[PDB]
Amino acid sequence: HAVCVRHAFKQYGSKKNPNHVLSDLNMTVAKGTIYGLLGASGCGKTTLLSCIVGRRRLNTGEIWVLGGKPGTKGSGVPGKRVGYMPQEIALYGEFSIKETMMYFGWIFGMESSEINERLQFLLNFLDLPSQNRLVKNLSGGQQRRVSFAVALMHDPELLILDQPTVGVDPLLRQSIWNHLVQITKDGNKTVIITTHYIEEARQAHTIGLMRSGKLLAEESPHVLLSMYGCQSLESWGKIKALLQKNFLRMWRNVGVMLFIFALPVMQVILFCLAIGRDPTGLKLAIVNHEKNYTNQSYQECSFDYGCKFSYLSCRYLNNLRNSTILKEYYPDPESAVDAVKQGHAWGALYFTENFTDALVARMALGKDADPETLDQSEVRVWLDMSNQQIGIILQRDLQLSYQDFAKDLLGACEQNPDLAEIPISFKEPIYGSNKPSFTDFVAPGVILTIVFFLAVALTSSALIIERMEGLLDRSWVAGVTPGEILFSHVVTQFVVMCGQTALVLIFMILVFGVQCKGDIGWVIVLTILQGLCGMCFGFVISAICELERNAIQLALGSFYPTLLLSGVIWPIEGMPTVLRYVSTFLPLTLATTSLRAMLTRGWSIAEPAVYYGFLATIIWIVAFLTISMLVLRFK
Amino acid sequence: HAVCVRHAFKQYGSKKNPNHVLSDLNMTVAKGTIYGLLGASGCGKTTLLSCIVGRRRLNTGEIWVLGGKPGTKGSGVPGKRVGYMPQEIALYGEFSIKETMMYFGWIFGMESSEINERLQFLLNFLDLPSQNRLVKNLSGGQQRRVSFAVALMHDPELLILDQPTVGVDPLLRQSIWNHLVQITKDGNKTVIITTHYIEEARQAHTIGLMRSGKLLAEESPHVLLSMYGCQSLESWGKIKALLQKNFLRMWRNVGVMLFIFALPVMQVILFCLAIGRDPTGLKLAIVNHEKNYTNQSYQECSFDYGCKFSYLSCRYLNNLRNSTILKEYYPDPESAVDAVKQGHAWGALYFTENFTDALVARMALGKDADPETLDQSEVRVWLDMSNQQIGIILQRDLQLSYQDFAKDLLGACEQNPDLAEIPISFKEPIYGSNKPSFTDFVAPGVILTIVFFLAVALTSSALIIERMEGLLDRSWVAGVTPGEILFSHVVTQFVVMCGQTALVLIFMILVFGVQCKGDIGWVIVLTILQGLCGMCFGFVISAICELERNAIQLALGSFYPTLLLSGVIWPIEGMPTVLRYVSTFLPLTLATTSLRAMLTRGWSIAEPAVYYGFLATIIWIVAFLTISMLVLRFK
Ligand SMILES: Nc1ncnc2c1ncn2[C@@H]1O[C@H](COP(=O)(O)OP(=O)(O)OP(=O)(O)O)[C@@H](O)[C@H]1O
Numbered sequence A, B: 001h002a003v004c005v006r007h008a009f010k011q012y013g014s015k016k017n018p019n020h021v022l023s024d025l026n027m028t029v030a031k032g033t034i035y036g037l038l039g040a041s042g043c044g045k046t047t048l049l050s051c052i053v054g055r056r057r058l059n060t061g062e063i064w065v066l067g068g069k070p071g072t073k074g075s076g077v078p079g080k081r082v083g084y085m086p087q088e089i090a091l092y093g094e095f096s097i098k099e100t101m102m103y104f105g106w107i108f109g110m111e112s113s114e115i116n117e118r119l120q121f122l123l124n125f126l127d128l129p130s131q132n133r134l135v136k137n138l139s140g141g142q143q144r145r146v147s148f149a150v151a152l153m154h155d156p157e158l159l160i161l162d163q164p165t166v167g168v169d170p171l172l173r174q175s176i177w178n179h180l181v182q183i184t185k186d187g188n189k190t191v192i193i194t195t196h197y198i199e200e201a202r203q204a205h206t207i208g209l210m211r212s213g214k215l216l217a218e219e220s221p222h223v224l225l226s227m228y229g230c231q232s233l234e235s236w237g238k239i240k241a242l243l244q245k246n247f248l249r250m251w252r253n254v255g256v257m258l259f260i261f262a263l264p265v266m267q268v269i270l271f272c273l274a275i276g277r278d279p280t281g282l283k284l285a286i287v288n289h290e291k292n293y294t295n296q297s298y299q300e301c302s303f304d305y306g307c308k309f310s311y312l313s314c315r316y317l318n319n320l321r322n323s324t325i326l327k328e329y330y331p332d333p334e335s336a337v338d339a340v341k342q343g344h345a346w347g348a349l350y351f352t353e354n355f356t357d358a359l360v361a362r363m364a365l366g367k368d369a370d371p372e373t374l375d376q377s378e379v380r381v382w383l384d385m386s387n388q389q390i391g392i393i394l395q396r397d398l399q400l401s402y403q404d405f406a407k408d409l410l411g412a413c414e415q416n417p418d419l420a421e422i423p424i425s426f427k428e429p430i431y432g433s434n435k436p437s438f439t440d441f442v443a444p445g446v447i448l449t450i451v452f453f454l455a456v457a458l459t460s461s462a463l464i465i466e467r468m469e470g471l472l473d474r475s476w477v478a479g480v481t482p483g484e485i486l487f488s489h490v491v492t493q494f495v496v497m498c499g500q501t502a503l504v505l506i507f508m509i510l511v512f513g514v515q516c517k518g519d520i521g522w523v524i525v526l527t528i529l530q531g532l533c534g535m536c537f538g539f540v541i542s543a544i545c546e547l548e549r550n551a552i553q554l555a556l557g558s559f560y561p562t563l564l565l566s567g568v569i570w571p572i573e574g575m576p577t578v579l580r581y582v583s584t585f586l587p588l589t590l591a592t593t594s595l596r597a598m599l600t601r602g603w604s605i606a607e608p609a610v611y612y613g614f615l616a617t618i619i620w621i622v623a624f625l626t627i628s629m630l631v632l633r634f635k
């Protein structure tokens, strides 16, 4: 009694329109007999073979195969002792015969020195081309022989062959049907072959027949006659097996695999060469009314150097920045405000005709300057602050350049160069530098973000291409637990993840100068943990989504929200009291802050603000793994 | 006659090791005969049929089918007069029988009121379930009858079928083979059927035979059986067709279709609520040495309001900000610099015990101040500038709040609050506002990026999904040119693109209140015509990528090089001359500048900094279309 099902009850669809594919289905498969499951096109026949191998639940029925119900420790359906073959060719297209016969080879614990030994016999028995040819150029008839040979070499004790001779010449059909008889002679195997060639199935021993959702009769072919008609017929092996297949997948498309190693370097060079550097090509409209106006980009600047004050208007000029500001001269203030208005400059200074006289009478006299006097020593400037980032550095430079001009007047002729100072003294910063830049605040948040997104793109179509290329539903029967496909995907992608994580760190620290006052060793550990969380975030997306087009847009749709909720281009303190609290329990918000306290401040792991990032990035790794595992086990 | 090939040559393998599948291949199909093409399993049989229909091109040979060669206007192979059923089931699984019949119905130009009668007749002839049952829900035998019916209803004059009776019971196979004879009694059509069931091929009358790349016999079966043996001889219709199919695959994912309409309202609300707002929570270490130290949040602030100068340190306090700055008090500067050092504050002020005495004199003698009294009225502050963004606001607030304190002293007893500012007066900005903010600079340029990236997510898995669900190999034969497949892919996605582009604009201008001074009419056109470039950019990715795994990686991996090279978070003036010059020739760098000159400045299209964005992004739309045309047309 290899297979025996009692009172099967299955149906498709809703209760309003039931299908009722199977009603009773009482059958018995003996040991050592070629069970032929003949029938009619339309009844439930494949749904019974797929229920024997435990691919579909029997819907409140009694089943018993090789000892017990499929998928139970008391049975043997999932394992090396049960053969299988799908109705359609479930074969990987990028694997050659010598590789597709070895991927299924040592899943069943088969030695590598015997798979090759028996491959020659299997290739000589049924005609096939050289073993080096990939199984995608094979014809429609040679793609069925490979499938027949793949799930027959391991010598099981039960065969679930269905339609194994569709698309072959009659001689090859006889040769195939002459093989199942020979291996079954000495009571060592059972065959459940079902075929649509009713005449060809006369060699069976327990020919079956189905009429309406149940077996009609199960007798010998020579006994079925004279009663109904007159004449004729009316572990370590599994892990290694699917680890050389993931590695082989990347090697098949060399040129694209090398592209992923040229993305982090290109994504980093652009960032370091664009963000942070100040503008150096902004012009100005100077209309100083104390010297003759000749030409346009030219004006005299021969002022006086010493105690005697003269031409002070062209002493503030040439004292401002000589590189970031370009000087162009206009004769009339009503023309300077015109040029900037039509986008020909970024501002317009204006020095009154009596500027030196008005300025020398404002410093000599203290707290006794009349309103008229303190109205012509002013430097009127109209700023085109429509950029909110260039006008900020323009108004931050004009007044800052006046400090040097003020010190030059005082520190060279009259007194010490310290009177012209605001009482607010900023001393020396404890941790940072007195000249902050936008390229130092954002770089901590970019290195942890580039790695996170690259890992997401890597493991985004990993769990979704298993059904794309087949070789999955027929591999579940082979004993591959769902927890091993996910585990091996982590190992193969983590190896290549570290190949680009180091490139990000090397090109951001060695080639481009970024301060690393803290421990360099712990920076590497935190970065690869974030990348591991990133690749774990791509598995839940792949597991939840089913369609190929349904998963690309979901990870792609998460680009901006994690770039704003995390603190990258703006401090986390600017958000309201509710959004900020919610935006703390996220993978990236508590990691950039921890990394920002290690690159600049120089703290160690023992500080409370540093190890929180490690604690908050490990929990999400576990949470992104159990959720993905639960979904895979669910279906 | 109908089909004839003269001296056909074809090989599959590379040089020095060819396959030599076909050598001469001379045959002739008669006017109305049933040409049965039998042969061995392994010779070139399917390749001959695929070369007849133009799917594969001969190497050095002459072909002539229905009055000329395939792909030429003289021969009607890529038209409605050639039937074609493939060896494998190339049927879309998400289409019901009625839908999958009407999709092929009005491709050949069949009236909608005529397809139903033929569908009913075919369903009655060959048994099938209800017409609204999904194809993917059918069995393995009922999925072949649908394919047979699809390539037969339009009544062609030449039927090309290969293996049309694999997977069906003999009772129905006899009826299938009894139908190709009844419809061929009159001299109207030719049937070219290749089958491996040689017993059923006797009904034809032009049986062929192949040994090695060459036809062997072209004789009648009753003549072949008596020659050298006894027995066992070894365009509007097309456009509407795939426009209700694109609109159909977007209706079976209502859970996802509603999600794509919620991404724009989530990516915008997060942006407007996190970026731009000034930080509100930060503390300071105030150690004013002029009042008794009680508790940790109390200093008895009472600075004798009026003209009398007393407790000027207390007067400077409560004058910084009542909202954004918190106050915490310490007794010793050696303890204030300790608390900030271990992350318990952001700075540490320090007022000397004689602050009022040393400050009431600095404003009294003025120029004649001695160095001893100079360094006794300074508010010593140590700033923890490790954030480079909060430490700037704090540095920009301590000195800015001193201006109010200075005016509060001048304008209190007897003076005018005018002689407290530097000789630099910034007047009134021509275009911008006197208080720039970071939220108004990134807004015109994130709105374009959001639309651009969402469009890429939409049309990225379009051209790579056509070959996944079949219905393409047999669609090229049915007169469907590559031009109309992509064109039909643009209209269906442009309609849904506008459904989320308006959501971005409405939630950014109407609700949150982003200013728009220039013209609201032309902003819609620019942001709609820019998103069209984004959806055309994704078609290039799908055209040049065969494997789907390279689509997510390429599309998602080309986003950071867009933010860092378009001027979104930094003006384009800091990059070197070479990088800046190259960057202007990009779809987004010349569009944000055009848009930034419309919401802020108020300019119109006639200005020559505005229409450049329209001109420099229309070109990229054309360039992204011809490139997708060339790759899709010829590979
Ligand atoms: N996934 C499914 N969902 C719903 N009904 C299904 C499904 N698969 C098959 N059926 C229905 O179940 C019945 C039997 O299908 P089954 O797959 O068992 O046929 P079969 O014996 O393999 O067919 P054939 O010999 O014609 O290839 C049919 O009515 C079929 O439409």
Ligand SMILES: Nc1ncnc2c1ncn2[C@@H]1O[C@H](COP(=O)(O)OP(=O)(O)OP(=O)(O)O)[C@@H](O)[C@H]1O
Pocket (backbone or CB within 6 Å): A136, A137, A138, A139, A140, A141, A142, A167, A168, B012, B013, B019, B021, B040, B041, B042, B043, B044, B045, B046, B047, B048
């Ligand atoms: N894409 C391909 N690239 C290279 N060789 C190929 C390709 N397709 C088929 N071949 C080989 O060229 C020959 C063409 O075989 P073909 O597909 O015509 O066989 P067939 O008669 O349809 O097969 P069968 O009846 O066994 O299913 C075979 O030797 C096959 O192995």
Ligand SMILES: [Mg+2]
Pocket (backbone or CB within 6 Å): A046, A087, A162, A163, B140
């Ligand atoms: Mg079957």
Ligand SMILES: [Mg+2]
Pocket (backbone or CB within 6 Å): A140, B045, B046, B087, B162, B163, B194
């Ligand atoms: Mg064939």
